[PDB]
Symmetry: D2
Subunit: 285 residues, 4 copies
Amino acid sequence: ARVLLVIDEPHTDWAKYFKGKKIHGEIDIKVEQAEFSDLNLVAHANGGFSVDMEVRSLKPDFVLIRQHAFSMARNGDYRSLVIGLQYAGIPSVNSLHSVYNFCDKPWVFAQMVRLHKKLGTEEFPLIDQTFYPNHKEMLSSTTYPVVVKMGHAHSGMGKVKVDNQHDFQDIASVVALTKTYATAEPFIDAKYDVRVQKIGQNYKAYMRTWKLEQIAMSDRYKLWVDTCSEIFGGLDICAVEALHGKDGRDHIIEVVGSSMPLIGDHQDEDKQLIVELVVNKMTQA
Amino acid sequence: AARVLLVIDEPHTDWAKYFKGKKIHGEIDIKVEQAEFSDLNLVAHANGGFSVDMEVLRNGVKVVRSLKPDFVLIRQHAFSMARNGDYRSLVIGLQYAGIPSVNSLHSVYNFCDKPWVFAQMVRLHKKLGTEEFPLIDQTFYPNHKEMLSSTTYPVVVKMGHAHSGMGKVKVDNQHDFQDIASVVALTKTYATAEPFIDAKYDVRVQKIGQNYKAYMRTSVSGNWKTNTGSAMLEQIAMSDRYKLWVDTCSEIFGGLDICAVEALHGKDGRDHIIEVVGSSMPLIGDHQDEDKQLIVELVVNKMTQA
Amino acid sequence: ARVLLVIDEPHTDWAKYFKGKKIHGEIDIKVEQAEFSDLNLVAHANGGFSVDMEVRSLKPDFVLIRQHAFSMARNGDYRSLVIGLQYAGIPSVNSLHSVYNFCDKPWVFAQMVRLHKKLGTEEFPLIDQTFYPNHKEMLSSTTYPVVVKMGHAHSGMGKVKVDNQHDFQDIASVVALTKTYATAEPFIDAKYDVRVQKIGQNYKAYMRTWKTNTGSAMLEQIAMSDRYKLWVDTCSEIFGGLDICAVEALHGKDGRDHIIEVVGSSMPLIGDHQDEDKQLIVELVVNKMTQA
Amino acid sequence: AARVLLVIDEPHTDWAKYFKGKKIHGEIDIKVEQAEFSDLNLVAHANGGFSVDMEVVVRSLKPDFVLIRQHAFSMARNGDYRSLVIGLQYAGIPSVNSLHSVYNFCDKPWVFAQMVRLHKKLGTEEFPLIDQTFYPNHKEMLSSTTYPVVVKMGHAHSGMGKVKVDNQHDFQDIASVVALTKTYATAEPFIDAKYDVRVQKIGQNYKAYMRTSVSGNWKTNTGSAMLEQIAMSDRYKLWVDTCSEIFGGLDICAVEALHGKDGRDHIIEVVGSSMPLIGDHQDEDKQLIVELVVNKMTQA
Ligand SMILES: Nc1ncnc2c1ncn2[C@@H]1O[C@H](COP(=O)(O)OP(=O)(O)OP(=O)(O)O)[C@@H](O)[C@H]1O
Ligand SMILES: Nc1ncnc2c1ncn2[C@@H]1O[C@H](COP(=O)(O)OP(=O)(O)OP(=O)(O)O)[C@@H](O)[C@H]1O
Ligand SMILES: Nc1ncnc2c1ncn2[C@@H]1O[C@H](COP(=O)(O)OP(=O)(O)OP(=O)(O)O)[C@@H](O)[C@H]1O
Ligand SMILES: Nc1ncnc2c1ncn2[C@@H]1O[C@H](COP(=O)(O)OP(=O)(O)OP(=O)(O)O)[C@@H](O)[C@H]1O
Ligand SMILES: [Ca+2]
Ligand SMILES: [Ca+2]
Ligand SMILES: [Ca+2]
Ligand SMILES: [Ca+2]
């Protein structure tokens, strides 16, 4: 029986979705589930290794990662477990390589910058964004308001709207206390934001209208996510988020990996899709 | 043999000049060494032995010269949560070596957490009452989790331990407060929130030894932070009111030789004390040269007592 | 009913030890107990405040601190809670001031360095320790072996025996990764080590028979000498006074004593009089609460 | 319009000297700008605009290329320059080694993992990777099968954080120290080495040096030691060739291995473009690096 470790919150019962699924028609799949916070491991270059949960130990043959491997908030650093999993040679979705490299939002943005550079604005409208290695480079902005995003954090954390020079200077003084990097980008007066996802070969576009209706995929939206899905060796599960300004201009602000939240009326379909995806990946091994 | 005095301060002020010709007991000369925290290190032995190492730029070659100070004057902030602003171990080292200081090393170490110092003012306020010691209403949050909301807006949020306006922001509403709380989570430290005061001006009452001065500061750049941007300073008369403020605060942590009390003066006529600073308070106004001389007098007298 | 918050692990049922105890003869005492890791609070300059536990909230009239307030190990920093309690103006044992100042072992040691300078080696034999603000000052050592103690940690953590120059250099390079200070001191070929404790006005001395801290060891309560009493009485005066404290010393095979540390109100209770010590602590707390 | 090359290296090597007279496509000049990570900062815009600020006066530049000779990360205070690497990539500035490999080289265990893969593929005979155990944090550090071992704490250089442990009691003391570093660590068999070897590869040039101590230290990079260049073998060529393909390709790299007294080799690490130049051919290596960079610059 093949052991699949799914790093995810307890709500979604992954064992339920993998129930009955078999590799090559007879190799059963056992599902072990737990959050990053309850895991630890030890890996040997020789191949031996063990993942400890809660305390029960297991040896996953594969891993599905649905949780953020890193957050600059307290207790959110799980990079060393990602390193350990890679060290033990365990295959995963998304790839451990992409997971590790997704641990710095500006590092992932840089990849889109390169994409934007090749494709041009009419094909890939990447939002205008500025990167600051530290607060010392934060002096002012061309226009206001702007959205400042501090360090590497999720669910709105560390993201503030700044309406003027004085406030910017204050916010910059706060970046100094985070002792990390930050970005600033034009605040978009949005009519709504859209997220284009891609799981394996399935695509879906959702329209949500400061901080849900499924729409039709377009060739434009497909290009956005197809191009983004190729970074860091390829992302099996990813999505592109863009803001649609009242003036009709689109602005791509981010690309998410395998921890992207499932949304809308089809969360069930998407989980099954992820299951189909992981089963196929496990099959090849 | 000359007594060695180490002054920890930025190079803008040349203390050697101010201590020139000052003698202890009339015949002992004072040799002044000066440097910033960033260029200092030391080693201290329980038996009394010790050495202070100072990095100096002697013509391109980064040279380290060691000294054995008999006394120390601390004019720089020993701690800041900004990168490279943590000099607490040097303060511990100086105390470990038993070096006398101004202000006392004990007070300096205990001044490394603004809310910890503020707690002393809270005690003094419960004791003296609002009429005589109008401490501002402030709330202390050990971490971001307890930052849910405020009774009134706008509020001024002060993150961790920092200076010169660093880490302080004005928040006008509930939604913005929640965003700021999420930022606090990224600083991974404590934070305080206090009522934003529409101030006519702010004032600072200082006490150097037995010399008192009060200054009023007004912004002329539309900065609610009057220490940020150009502003106007006006020295004002000392009052019994101002004197009580700095006298009572000057007694904390065993006694502060150099200290000051900052208060905001509302447009509605109400005063609000927001902080007491130690021996690293910036000299201000048009009497800075006098204050430096007052500090020499104080230090020389403290050195004589040893 | 006065509320007493006891910060300690659950192995000790403080509610039981305080059961029946009343202040002034009629005011009952309500005991709330929890570890630092399960606590949070909010304090206002106006006197308002709340301590949140686990989630249930309380308003302690007094606190007894039995847990280390600071450790450089991950998750061990509770200094902000000690600041909060002081900000809320809550009385404590030991005093919150002393607890805060005990959060840097070398800072505490510095107080003993002064006592030693006043008393003299014959009265107060403080061990020959060296303080390094950071690793850059860690070059060598007069003698070997030495014991290096990194940062601020407990129960033997971060402490290592170093036998030679080269090993010292390697260990110094590790201090660099801790990004904090460290101390070095002569390794004592100890016959045994002793701990002289003082809880209120009750004194006890125990002899324990290289880290007698780690693994199985034997304890023998020994007589208090005036010498021992002097060590703990003087150390008990630092930072405004310690209601609970103990001095640790190493006794070398050559007959010499070496004081290596004074612990505060979170000192572990040891030997066979631990129940009595808890009872002495209860008496102490009740006396303190009565005066408020 | 001369091309700007920013070299991130310490003042010792005068890179401008080595690039003097070199021109792209025959006529385009190359201006060399040099500085250490500590004296650099920058700003990058998604629109392409950007600037590098060097404390020389705070002069600012717009490198057309970058050569990185300095470690981008160290867990010692002030050794974290990862955000500058991210910044350079955000600005889309070509580099040697690739900024991608530089960023991924900021965790020794992450790189070692790559060498684990190659070992699984190649076998001990061709790729004798040392027996190493990775610990995410001090909690899994219970004991060792054999002693003595070498504990390598977190991510650091020049011997920092590396200690020899001769027994269980000492392993536990060191485990408690790791707890204080609040990071990962690895443990590996201590090798009674006759000497240790390093096989380097710069572009298409290979070299192999052997180093042995003479100051009494097991860390032969600490104290007086003797270096001796030796002959390249196909065994060595395989080592550096295989590792040079990781993270999209390493322009400059080397594989370090220990040669036990029992005759066995043990590979312990692969370094990137900030590997120190050793031996009697440092001038030649700096020249090979100039050629490599000139070529890379030519292609852009
Ligand atoms: N530049 C901008 N202009 C206007 N609104 C913005 C901008 N950037 C972000 N927002 C708004 O803030 C929301 C959250 O921003 P962002 O997606 O960066 O946060 P996040 O922490 O990555 O979110 P989550 O983790 O919930 O995916 C966006 O959905 C959008 O509504
Ligand atoms: N609650 C407040 N309401 C109104 N203005 C405020 C408030 N708090 C601070 N300010 C303004 O900002 C200035 C700086 O604030 P504060 O003194 O707290 O910062 P700081 O970092 O300690 O600065 P410095 O080191 O210059 O003392 C005050 O002098 C005042 O002008
Ligand atoms: N200099 C020394 N020479 C010899 N043995 C020593 C020395 N320092 C410490 N030890 C031994 O190690 C034990 C624990 O060391 P120490 O008390 O410094 O550690 P700790 O972390 O404070 O421990 P605990 O929290 O148990 O008090 C001592 O009781 C003694 O047995
Ligand atoms: N397992 C081991 N057994 C024996 N000697 C070892 C072992 N690991 C390292 N050494 C010795 O220590 C030296 C330095 O170790 P290592 O290369 O791990 O350190 P480093 O910090 O990466 O140093 P550098 O950056 O100079 O490469 C090696 O050259 C070798 O002589
Ligand atoms: Ca998002
Ligand atoms: Ca102030
Ligand atoms: Ca102890
Ligand atoms: Ca190496």
